[PDB]
């Protein structure tokens, strides 16, 4: 699709068999989802942004369907204010910025 | 133009006549620049993201040219590791997400 930016670019995703809402976020290196369980192994990681650093759980090789497009990659789980799809998965679905 | 997301989408902007590097950020409501010494009136604001909130200075009606595309609006100044162009200005330059 083509998405304008008058509103936050929120879309539905499927992860771990569940539906969630998430923000398509070109300013994110990584994909960060609110606290939940995902299948498999995880390890601690720290990530930063605007307010500083947080601790997250790093899950690798997680399938995520993003407005019907498939990705498989790292998903970080932790106390993010909003679920965000970062560049690690946006690249997989072919997302670009255009102006 | 078209910007891919293999690396951070850093572009040249001009603010106060000066060229700077900033991230085109669809996950940002606002534009956050570290330009601590603009003249003009400002007011205090707090903005949040992954690590919590920070204090910023809110400057209104500031011209910001993004890759040769002129914009004008609110710029928030505060300590950030990367200058970010948020949706308040991205919409002015007709930027969309596409996949």
């Amino acid at each position: 699709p083509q998405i304008t930016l008058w509103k936050r670019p929120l879309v539905t995703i499927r992860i771990g068999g569940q539906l969630k809402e998430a923000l398509l976020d070109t300013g994110a290196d990584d994909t960060v989802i609110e606290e939940l369980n995902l299948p498999g192994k995880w390890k601690p990681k720290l990530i930063g942004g605007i307010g500083g650093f947080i601790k997250v759980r790093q899950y690798d090789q997680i399938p995520v369907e993003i407005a019907g497009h498939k990705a498989i990659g790292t998903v970080l789980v932790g106390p993010t204010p909003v679920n965000i799809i970062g560049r690690n998965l946006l690249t997989q679905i072919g997302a670009t910025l255009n102006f | 133009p078209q910007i891919t997301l293999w690396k951070r989408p850093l572009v040249t902007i001009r603010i106060g006549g000066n060229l700077k590097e900033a991230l085109l950020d669809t996950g940002a409501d606002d534009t956050v620049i570290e330009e601590l010494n603009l003249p003009g009136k400002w007011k205090p604001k707090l903005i949040g993201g992954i690590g919590g909130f920070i204090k910023v200075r809110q400057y209104d009606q500031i011209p910001v040219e993004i890759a040769g595309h002129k914009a004008i609006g609110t710029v928030l100044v505060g300590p950030t590791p990367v200058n970010i162009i948020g949706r308040n200005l991205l919409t002015q330059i007709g930027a969309t997400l596409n996949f």
């Binding site: 290196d29 993010t80 | 940002a28 903005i47 993201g49």
Partner: peptide
């Protein structure tokens, strides 16, 4: 990792 503003 840096991850972006509300």
């Amino acid at each position: 990792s840096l991850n972006x503003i509300x």
